[PDB]
Amino acid sequence: EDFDTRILEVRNVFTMTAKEGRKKSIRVLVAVGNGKGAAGFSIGKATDRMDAFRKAKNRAVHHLHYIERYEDHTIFHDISLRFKRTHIKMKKQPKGYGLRCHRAIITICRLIGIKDMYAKVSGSINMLSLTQGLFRGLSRQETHQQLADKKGLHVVEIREECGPLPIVVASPRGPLRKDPEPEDEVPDVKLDWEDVKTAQGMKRSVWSNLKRAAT
Amino acid sequence: ETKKPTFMDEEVQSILTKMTGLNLQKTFKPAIQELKPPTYKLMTQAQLEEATRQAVEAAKVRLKMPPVLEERVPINDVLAEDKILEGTETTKYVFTDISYSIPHRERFIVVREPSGTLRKASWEERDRMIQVYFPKEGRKILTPIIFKEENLRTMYSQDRHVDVLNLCFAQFEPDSTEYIKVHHKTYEDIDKRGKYDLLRSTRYFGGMVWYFVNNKKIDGLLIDQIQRDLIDDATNLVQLYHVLHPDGQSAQGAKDQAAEGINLIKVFAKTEAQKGAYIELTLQTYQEALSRHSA
């Protein structure tokens, strides 16, 4: 009862048979979730649509992922992954930002319980690859406690709203290292031209930052 | 001979700085404003203690007390009386020197009246003209209605005394009559309802204490400090009171009895305190709980 089900795709697929010729079936993709981190998706197949709905939603609850949420409203860090040919770039956002994501991502995020996130989908926009990529990215995120334990250092959060106050969000359960993390003068991290182009005021799109209904 | 201390004396600033207190959670409360995604750092116990030390320094700047100034004297200076211009204009002219590199209290702002008199603009005209041509963030040319008595009581009912003072500081000059009247009305509502904790860890606590000490009404604040186990602050309060009222019954009593520590509060409670009975009781209770902890 705590789980809600949402349809993501309903497709009429066809196979050719020797006797009956062009045969019609239904392929359904549904996502399930309880809004508290437990969510999953499953494909459903049947000749009738209502049978595909039953198979998909009932199967999905046996294939649930648990998705960690930062402060139970957003993801722990920016997630950039490719699943086959579908690229998904997700950004951690503060409260009140809402879900500014592909409509299917909005639907899935409400089932997980994510309230604030930005996402951009590029490449092949395939619902099944988008859904499967989304759950892979969200399942493989490192929490702050995991980061603190891995590096044996405190995880300190700095907020411009709170000024210079250092907010310890996670501390290592084991011993605490005494050697500061090396400060590389210049990081050898790969950057996305879209993020850099935007931060420089060079990304000029009539479609970006448009006024939309609350999501 | 013997001068009484000023608000900005190093001795008074140190006493009032400690009585104020520093709470990093309150001083850096999360502001309700446009937000950005937070940043994260991996820190050792030393790097964290250093980051917390810097936050304390940034807070001591944010808690810098505004100077307490006396009311400004009205400006009534006539520069010229050109009677030949009498009745030639129906509306007066206000001339403001907008030369960029001049302090605002040194800017000549004059008014040509319909009578022909060239006079210096009044303090109220000055602050209005400076806002027109040198607009300051948070200041309005017309006085906001929040400062009406009916609207300040609403802010007091919500325990928003610190917002009232932030609004008053942004709108009025420290020597203005509105700035002083609003601060005094706010300090009085705190004393009547015992809301002294609303100003702790803020830059407005010292100005509030200065008001109570000069007006000989520290009984409420002294009780509040004892009920909160702040006897060090309660003892400094009675010492600050003696420093600013040396020729007083309590100051002499402390000299005659060479009182120190908690004894100062007992001497003050008997001689000058109006609520002397409620202080001894409040102080008695504290000594008991302190003995229970010792035993």
Curated annotation (Swiss-Prot), chain A:
Q: Which GO terms describe its biological process?
A: mitochondrial translation; translation
GO MF term list: RNA binding; structural constituent of ribosome
Where does the S5 DRBM domain lie?
A: 3-67
List the subcellular locations: Mitochondrion
This protein's UniProt keywords: Mitochondrion, Ribonucleoprotein, Ribosomal protein
Record's Gene Ontology CC terms?
mitochondrial inner membrane; mitochondrial small ribosomal subunit; mitochondrion
Q: Does the keyword Chaperone apply?
A: no
Q: Which family does it belong to?
A: Belongs to the universal ribosomal protein uS5 family.
UniProt-recorded name of the protein: Small ribosomal subunit protein uS5m
Lineage of the organism: Eukaryota, Metazoa, Chordata, Craniata, Vertebrata
> What gene does this protein come from?
MRPS5
The shown chain, on whole-protein numbering, covers 216 to 430 of 430
From Swiss-Prot, chain B:
**Where does the UniProt annotation locate this protein?**
Mitochondrion
Question: Which GO terms fall under biological process for this protein?
Answer: mitochondrial translation
What Gene Ontology terms describe what this protein does at the molecular function level? structural constituent of ribosome
Q: Identify the main location.
A: mitochondrion
According to the UniProt entry, the coiled-coil residues are none
- Where N6-acetyllysine occurs along the chain? 148
Q: Which UniProt keywords apply?
A: Acetylation, Disease variant, Mitochondrion, Phosphoprotein, Primary mitochondrial disease, Ribonucleoprotein, Ribosomal protein
Result of mutating residue 139 to H? Answer: In ODG7; uncertain significance
One cellular component (GO) term of this entry: mitochondrial small ribosomal subunit
Listed under subunit, the entry gives: Component of the mitochondrial small ribosomal subunit (mt-SSU). Mature mammalian 55S mitochondrial ribosomes consist of a small (28S) and a large (39S) subunit. The 28S small subunit contains a 12S ribosomal RNA (12S mt-rRNA) and 30 different proteins. The 39S large subunit contains a 16S rRNA (16S mt-rRNA), a copy of mitochondrial valine transfer RNA (mt-tRNA(Val)), which plays an integral structural role, and 52 different proteins.
Q: Which disease is it linked to?
A: Combined oxidative phosphorylation deficiency 5: A mitochondrial disease resulting in severe metabolic acidosis, edema, hypertrophic cardiomyopathy, tubulopathy, and hypotonia. Ovarian dysgenesis 7: A form of ovarian dysgenesis, a disorder characterized by lack of spontaneous pubertal development, primary amenorrhea, uterine hypoplasia, and hypergonadotropic hypogonadism as a result of streak gonads. ODG7 is an autosomal recessive condition.
What family classification does the UniProt entry report for this protein? Belongs to the mitochondrion-specific ribosomal protein mS22 family.
Q: What is this protein called?
A: Small ribosomal subunit protein mS22
Q: Which gene encodes it?
A: MRPS22
Q: Which residues of the full protein are shown?
A: 64 to 358 of 360
